[PDB]
Ligand binder design. Structure first.
Ligand SMILES: NC(=O)[C@H]1CCC(=O)N([C@H]2CCCc3ccccc32)C1
Ligand SMILES: [Zn+2]
Length: 139
């Protein structure tokens, strides 16, 4: 679990969005595993606007943060789960590190701010859904 709170927006993994997220829907993209909903209270998270390929993410299944080197956002094949059939997930970044299904939502940050959230994993890999291209989150 986990979310990004920026301005009047909440960013979550689409497969973990609640009834309240869907009732306050702003934008969603199944191919990216993202959903953004509106909030009443103001969020203070900062979104990175950069091309960093190193950062630190929070891993809830280890109660720890880990430093990572990650690939640029790209179209990556992801195996079927109870939430999606096997498909290409877009805007996904991979890195070597621990991740289990419950780790989805953990934030990846660089020195500029939030880069993305955990979305995939297994086999000693962790995949992050990028949010740096969503410029409208800042306005
Ligand atoms: N983006 C997706 O398609 C995810 C939907 C929910 C979900 O459980 N996953 C799984 C795939 C198998 C390994 C695994 C490890 C860590 C995190 C997530 C997963 C993928
Ligand atoms: Zn950065």
């Amino acid at each position: 679990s986990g979310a990004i709170y920026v301005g009047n927006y909440r960013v979550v993994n689409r497969h973990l969005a609640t009834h309240n997220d869907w009732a306050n829907l702003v934008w969603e993209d199944s191919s990216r595993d993202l959903l953004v909903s509106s909030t009443t209270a103001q969020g203070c998270d900062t979104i990175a606007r950069c091309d960093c390929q190193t950062g630190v993410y929070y891993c809830s299944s280890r109660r720890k943060h880990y430093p990572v080197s990650f690939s640029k956002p790209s179209l990556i094949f992801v195996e079927a789960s109870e939430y999606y059939p096997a498909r290409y997930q877009s805007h996904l970044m991979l890195a070597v590190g621990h991740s289990e299904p419950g780790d989805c939502g953990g934030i990846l940050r660089c020195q500029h701010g939030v880069v993305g959230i955990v979305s995939t994993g297994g086999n000693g890999l962790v995949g992050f859904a990028d949010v740096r291209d969503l410029l409208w989150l800042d306005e």
